[PDB]
Amino acid sequence: AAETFKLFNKYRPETAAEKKERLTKEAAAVAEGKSKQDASPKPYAVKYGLNHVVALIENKKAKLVLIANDVDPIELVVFLPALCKKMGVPYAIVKGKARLGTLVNQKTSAVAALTEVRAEDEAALAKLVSTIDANFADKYDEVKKHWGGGILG
Amino acid sequence: FKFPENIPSDVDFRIMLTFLEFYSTLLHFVLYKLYTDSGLIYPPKLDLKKDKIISGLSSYILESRKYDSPVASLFSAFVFYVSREVPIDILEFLILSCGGNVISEAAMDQIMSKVTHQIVDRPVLKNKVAGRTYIQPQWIFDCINKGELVPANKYLPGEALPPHLSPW
């Protein structure tokens, strides 16, 4: 989870302040005009809207999905492990939607999809996928089927 | 005096910093009225290489946009040679209160036609120029407390000095 956060902090989305700042820069450029060039590769960032996260699945586009364990309407979330299971998407259940919101400039996020990666980071991506599929899909798959809890307090 | 002081652990800075900031802003605007009232520019410019010689009041150049007798322009047209031995700071400021010049060899080794007087406190004086007057610095401390000239035989090294009791 630590290296996953080190990954996703490389792919923080742009804040509203940074967005508006770049907008003012390019707008002052065109205001002088001083139309510098027409070139920008793409923005790459994490994807965090829940319907947008589900939307990036069923294409498939999600290379990694982080799923928060704690959501108070849990039923918003419960299909996502089975859905990434059947779609073959490398999902991982992360601990705490606040830590998702921190990496995406929200209060909470509860989902975290990531699709587009630079070539500098693509090799780290694949080994992280293999790491998760070793650590999550192998360890917890059979005990996922078992009825948890039931022991009194 | 500009000496490294052992810091006291007993004090708390949290009060003296408030006094500091209050006095800083207050003296700041009072320096504004004293610089504008004296008719010159409130930001004082300094040559950087003059500051590299010495970090003092003499670093600042003071722009444009009589003296009260006798203490102002006491020792008029008067050229000093303060040594490297003497404390440069308060003697420098006293000569600037006189209007005379300051020549220290301590400033010189960073890198003497009109010099008549050495302020020095040393037992053995090397070059012993009879043209140049050899004086222990209390002469400046006593002349300005009197406002007037006194003989320098007591202030000649290594003659003993009158126990100075200031006018208070």
Binding site: - | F3, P87, A106
Partner: protein, 248 residues
């Protein structure tokens, strides 16, 4: 404590880099000093001067005794400091960081500067800066009245000074400033005499505001300090008149 798995690797890699650049420095300087310049990069040495992307001007080295003031920097990220550089910093008393000292620059002095370059910062000092350092900081280890005597005293008594420096006839710590600036008769007397220097950390740190200062200063230090590891590394010099405005 269970330390970690990663720090032990990163320290090993960083010590590998440092031992490699130090061996390169040692071999290249041995070929220079033995004067067997056959197949090396360059014969003569260079000096960087960072002033205000900011302007970085180089000079050739002049074989002239130059007064330098050295300032110990916290070394790079996870590095065990090697025993060769540990020896030099032990001689120059630069352990317990934020600790400078005044030094003489000659051509016998110069090769160690390429060695300990990733741990200190160098430049040309000014008389006002030297003056401020000595009039505001400095303690002398001292044999006193009746002591167990690991005993250090701040610079107040010029008569304590001319006591132990009467043989060279050195009085009045202003003259110690003057002869460190001068180095005409004896610098090294004053150099062994003023033996410890201590500088405060520039930012107090722990607390909400000062972490911003720490991050901005780490970014500034990343812009300023450059780590060549080439063994023909130009000696980086910075404005100690700018630096002591921060640290003193």
């Amino acid at each position: 404590k269970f330390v970690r798995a990663e720090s032990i690797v990163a320290k090993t890699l960083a010590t590998s880099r440092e031992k490699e650049r130090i061996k390169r420095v040692s071999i290249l300087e041995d070929k220079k000093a033995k004067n067997e310049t056959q197949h090396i990069a360059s014969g003569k040495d260079f000096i960087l001067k960072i002033t205000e992307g900011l302007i970085r001007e180089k000079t050739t080295y002049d074989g002239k005794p130059a007064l330098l003031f050295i300032v110990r920097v916290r070394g790079p990220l996870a590095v065990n400091i090697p025993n060769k550089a540990f020896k030099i910093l032990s001689l120059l008393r630069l352990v317990e960081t934020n600790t400078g000292v005044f030094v003489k620059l000659t051509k016998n002095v110069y090769p160690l500067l390429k060695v300990i370059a990733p741990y200190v910062v160098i430049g040309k000092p000014s008389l006002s800066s030297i003056r401020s350092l000595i009039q505001k900081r400095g303690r002398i280890i001292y044999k006193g009245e009746n002591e167990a005597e690991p005993h250090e005293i701040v610079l107040n008594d010029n008569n304590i000074v001319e006591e132990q420096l009467g043989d060279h006839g050195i009085i009045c710590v202003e003259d110690i400033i003057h002869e460190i600036a001068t180095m005409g008769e004896s610098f090294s007397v004053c150099n062994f005499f003023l033996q410890p220097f201590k500088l405060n950390r520039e930012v107090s740190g722990f607390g909400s505001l000062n972490r911003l200062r720490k991050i901005k200063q780490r970014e500034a230090e990343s812009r300023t300090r450059q780590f060549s590891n080439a063994a023909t590394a130009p000696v980086i010099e910075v404005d100690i008149d700018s630096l002591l405005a921060k640290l003193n």
